Design an enzyme around this catalytic site. Structure first.
Site, PDB file in Angstrom:
ATOM      1  N   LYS C  34      44.488  28.221  41.998  1.00 23.66           N
ATOM      2  CA  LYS C  34      45.428  27.496  41.186  1.00 23.66           C
ATOM      3  C   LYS C  34      46.297  28.410  40.334  1.00 23.66           C
ATOM      4  O   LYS C  34      46.913  27.948  39.387  1.00 23.66           O
ATOM      5  CB  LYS C  34      44.655  26.527  40.290  1.00 23.66           C
ATOM      6  CG  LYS C  34      43.859  25.520  41.094  1.00 23.66           C
ATOM      7  CD  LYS C  34      43.113  24.504  40.230  1.00 23.66           C
ATOM      8  CE  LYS C  34      42.132  23.692  41.080  1.00 23.66           C
ATOM      9  NZ  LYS C  34      41.239  22.807  40.288  1.00 23.66           N
ATOM     10  N   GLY C  45      49.207  29.272  35.926  1.00 21.37           N
ATOM     11  CA  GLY C  45      48.179  28.430  36.484  1.00 21.37           C
ATOM     12  C   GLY C  45      48.521  26.978  36.295  1.00 21.37           C
ATOM     13  O   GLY C  45      49.275  26.623  35.380  1.00 21.37           O
TER      14      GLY C  45
END
Ligand SMILES: [Mg+2]
Ligand SMILES: [Mg+2]
Ligand SMILES: [Mg+2]
Ligand SMILES: [Mg+2]
Ligand SMILES: [Mg+2]
Ligand SMILES: [Mg+2]
Ligand SMILES: [Mg+2]
Ligand SMILES: [Mg+2]
Ligand SMILES: [Mg+2]
Ligand SMILES: [Mg+2]
Ligand SMILES: [Mg+2]
Lengths: 173, 173, 173, 173, 173, 173, 173, 173, 173, 173, 173
Positions: C34, C45
């Site tokens: 992510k 992120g």
């Protein structure tokens, strides 16, 4: 809100209270005027926010500009635009438009309402109470338009938690 | 959020707390400034997200640019645009705009609200508590604008779970 | 999801778990990254789907392209666009943007949040648990940024049924 | 629906059932193929209506045309477009895309999912049951990809009232 | 609300904040105690209204009366009654029950939860944040039970808009 | 409704407005008393319907009968009964109970609330506004309890569309 | 939750995970046992809260007491009572009841389900995934009941965000 | 509203009541005409607001302009546009269009309905009652179109709280 | 509505009932034809409003114009357009398209369905009943296509309150 | 429904309309009496169904039987019972109770309302309009109680679509 | 359902259709009788399920037993019980009760309705259509009660998708 118009004899009045309510809960201003002149012959009162109401007033001025002595037609053209314009449809308001001669109620459902013979028109959370009260007095000797209107506003605004006792008054016509 | 403005005498103040809350549940920042100067004569406080508030601030600067010393008019024009623009309408915010002379509250319902005679305006989840507190002190000897505003913020922010005790302060004027 | 950033001393770390959950009930992938670099100075992120997050990343790259050394401004401009664009508004995501110097959290409510003095920022279902854990360790001797972040991820991801124990790590500086 | 892909050894299979269900209630066709080739190297299975699925297939072909030997990138670009295009967003489908080398699952939430090490991917109301079953067999001696896939489909489709026992099979590699 | 219990070494603590919130909106009391002794060996903290919590405390006293040195059993019997009694089921609360030896969390879903090895239990809107924070400190040299508990409460209550910074403390062991 | 109690010095007052509202829309009576004496030492004000409030008053008299000079205990016992009795739970009301010595607020959520040090308690749709206003004046020289209470009622009832300007007053201590 | 029972040969196993989840989002305990013996011949596993599950267990013991060697009848009588008792109907749980000879699944919809010939029964959020996995292994040489059950729990609990990797095991036979 | 058209022999009539209702509860005007001529051959009656109905009338005039002697086709084209235009779809209305020769009913569901052999068409809240009444009289000696229509309006408008006893009448053819 | 097509031998038939229902409550026309020829080789029946169905028919004619003897392709292209066009998507309808050779069902979910081997296709609220009835007779000696279709329509329309006993019939092939 | 009572001088009148409405849309009876005597001194009018209203009347007779010359107390006791009895609470009605001396309004919210000094009380959908009209006439010379009541009923029932022009009249006182 | 009663001259008729509909969708029986005699002088028709209707019939027989020649009183007593009995209130039905002399309609709202002078009463989804039709014929020479009733049923049942053309007939007376 309570906006009321009574036409009796050679005279017509328009009244509005001055309460602005938020969240259907709290009074944010008790001294807001809900009536506007737009020339010598025409005044207008509104229920709804300043912005919504004014945006719709301006569009109405344009409709009077285009149809200069057909108040009713202008009103209808306004209602037509209001119902088909995506932007205008996101607004909540109701208007009463008053001249020496005609009175019209226009709402966001697209109704365009003229008085019955009694010359009474009203909008707002308090409007129907006012109409009722006015109608009780319309045919009673000694009550001119203003006197009727004031007594009805008292009654209506006393009832309607969303209207107050402070009124703006216009007279024609 | 609690943004409060008190005008008393030749002075007006504007205060805002610094709490940002997510999901109506948790504090994500306790040190966010909610007031912006935009020149020497005008400050503004906001309730709402950084992005929504700022977008609306910028549109307001443009309205002041166009109507340079009619603060009230600019406010009204902003509200008009805000209510008719599809994009702006997707934003939630409220603003208070302050100059030496005028103070206005503008919301996303399209209300444009000026103080009553007491010179008090407030927005946010805590705003009405602050207004109540300020009004209790507005006519009391010894309490200037700043002192009133600070005491009312204490009271209101103590009550409002969505406002905190850390405040930004502006004074004009 | 849990994305956490801890800045302590002349170091900042960014962690994210790797769980993708469908229907809020089943894990569809336990090994999804992510975090994305976008140059030498900036990593990011995301909580949200690959597509939503990446679409928003790309718009952010454009904002960095236009405002090259104001990370904060780019972030704000992104948030502004995100809130006014009809398309973007249909996306669910939150982002954390990290440089050696600055860290920002941006969400779809239009908040743009920088850390308090403790240098901690987090998003996702697990984010607030991670923030709480990190804050407990921020001022304790022996815990550098990475060690803090790792222990807080363990704790938060143990709690959050929507986050797992497998983490990606970036470090800057 | 149940679409399942198992990659084991030098081989990958893709299966889909053939049931079309209306109103989550009645079977309207028990012999609909849910798999399509699009060249020598790539097949694709879909859960969702013929029209939705095919519209999305075509957009995917265009993404493979533009990124000819990055299957994963094409998939991601498709997902990106799918999430931002107003029209595409009104479609419900999920896809699995299979080559000799890669397998990807793409949905309308914008997830782009590759298998874990076990080489198993599935979508549809039955998909998770199939995944579970396949995983039970993935490391067992004597079970090649096809055999695993068939046994899992039996199990999954027996469970899922929205999938049937009639399967289409593709093999690559 | 935030009620937290940390057992470490020869000691266990129980803390609760003092904020009572109405309508999830406003603080009605910032000085309400949420902990009660019921003898020399047992204290209990509650999230929920005075009346609900106390009614449930009394039923718990009766369960301890009947099962005098099985705290866990009493807890379970209470939960059993709570879930089957029509009246009790109309109450919202959660409890933590603490002795020198055992700690139990009981809620209105009928869960009866004892700590993991780390000796940490918490309830309330703030509880999970507190748990997270405590867990970060549980194994760190120099932090006894009280010190852990206080730091975690600070962190949790700073986060939880529904908990404040004023705590009651009990200690046993 | 707005019921307010202010204790300052050797004096405590209790005020209530007189508005009864139906359907959250209309005033049905503007002259309803919301305060009741129950002996020489105790008065009580209520928000809620005549029937609900009175039923709860009578149950409270019984609790005072049983616990004659523990006003707080009686209140708590009432709340306990109210929350567990099926019948009582169907009622909406809030009460404030006042003696020379103590003041308590009891609601249908089962909260039993005593003032902070400032001696102020209030209930009703207008109550929190009144509390805010009173707190602004509690420590100001020249303002005794009655004067505070009157000014805060003005302010609160001016704000609350569900409270009016006509008040009942009791004094003790 | 995942409770699984596999009967193969002259052996039957029953497994349950140990995760307790609150609000469908956070793990409150990762070490809760969901299996109970009730004599030498019968064990039972539950999905649902401790209180609900135990209340239902006790009613089941009574049904076994009344119908001592018809496990199936007791189960049916329990289900009958559960569906007609107002109190019991407010509980959420599912049970699996296991003896050397019989296995039954009972839920709150009033189903009473025995395994197909494969000897597999499962409940909980994770149950159907476990069933699918077990069925894949039931007829494969080398897999006894325990081994099957363990592998299926791994698989199911990996998938189910509401189940964990820590299991209790009973064996009969 | 009740709009009714009866064709019998070489005559057709069209009637509408005059009541405008707000909020489905109060009569705002009892004298509103719901019929409009648009040339010598064609009249039209509407249920719905003045604005909605007129907007739709104007679009219909355009369709008659384009398809001058296919009343039915114009009607169908109008319905087509009405169903596909975003703006028009936000309007509520139903229309009846009458010529010497043809009668059509058009609604916002996109139905275009011609009478059965009995020559009867009706719309509005009261329409189906009027149709029922008219059908009872259609084949009875002595009742011409007008007489039928009048008696059916009496009956229908007596029943329909949203229609009144005051009617507009057109005759052709 | 019930539209049914049965192909048996060198013959195919298409039947539709003639009922138009408003508000799922009342029959507004019992003599509406729901079948349209579009040349010598192709007929089509529809469930849905005159306007919706016809709009979709016309788009289908265009698809046949473009793909002249691939009826299936035209159908699929239509479905593709229908699902992606904003306007078309606001329409509810289903179609059956019949030629000597092929029969297709197309709906607004984007399904494109061809018969199983039995040559039977049906849509509408009554369609599945008709399909069931037809399938019972498809392989029975003495029943040609027309006879099957008539008997199944009787049965289905007797059952479906939204379909009537008056049918239009086409034959090809 | 509209029930109105006007007391002026040594006379009081009670009026009710006669319309019964079903489904809030159709008049089922236009000649239903909504007033009942219960002795020589007391009449009562009701809004609500015959059964609900009569059930409540009978309970009221019992309360008058128990408290023979406190009409007000009986009313309050009735309201108390009505609010706490499970059965009664399922009824919708409002009542006005009239004697030579007192008039009370009782509703299902548990309000018990006596007139202001003007002697006016009203219930029903039309009640508030009637109250408004009556109040306009209460202090005008020439209008006795009956005349006021009649004119206000005309007005209110003209407005209320759920009330008609046919009235029952009682006079006392 | 459609149950209709017409009294004209020395005669009264009662008719009911025979359609039973499930799920407001499908006809489950087209030959169910909805009329019952209960002695020589009284018949009754029902809309609602067999069980509901019959349960209510039996209670009505008991009320006639107790009040032997006051049909109206019995009806009222039945309605009273029906509204206050918890069990009866869970039933949906409407009844028409007919004697040589009186006719009453009773529903589950507790209305008890007698005809206007025209002698017409009806219930069921079709009832109002029937009433309308009957009223059109009531005063027309040549139409006795039966003839009126039959023509109205035809008309009503043709309209009402929930009523059919097969009628039961009783005559008295
Ligand atoms: Mg007022
Ligand atoms: Mg606060
Ligand atoms: Mg986890
Ligand atoms: Mg199946
Ligand atoms: Mg806090
Ligand atoms: Mg007020
Ligand atoms: Mg798991
Ligand atoms: Mg009417
Ligand atoms: Mg039928
Ligand atoms: Mg009326
Ligand atoms: Mg029918």
């Amino acid at each position: 809100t309570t906006i009321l118009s009574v036409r009796k004899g050679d005279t017509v009045v328009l009244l509005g209270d001055r309460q602005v309510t938020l969240g259907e809960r709290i009074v944010a201003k008790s001294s807001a005027c809900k009536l506007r002149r737009i020339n010598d012959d025409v005044v207008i009162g509104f229920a709804g926010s300043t912005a919504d109401a004014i945006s719709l007033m301006e569009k109405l001025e344009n409709k009077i500009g285009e149809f200069p002595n057909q108040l009713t037609r202008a009103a209808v053209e306004l209602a037509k635009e209001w119902r088909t314009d995506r932007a205008l449809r996101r607004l909540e308001a109701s208007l009463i438009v008053c001249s020496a001669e005609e009175t019209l109620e226009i709402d966001g459902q697209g109704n365009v309402i003229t008085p019955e013979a009694d010359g009474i028109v009203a909008i707002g959370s308090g409007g129907t109470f006012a109409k009722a009260a006015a109608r009780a007095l319309i045919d009673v000797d000694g009550y001119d338009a203003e006197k009727i209107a004031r007594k009805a506003m008292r009654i209506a605004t006393d009832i309607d938690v969303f209207s107050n006792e402070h009124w703006d008054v216009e007279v024609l016509e």
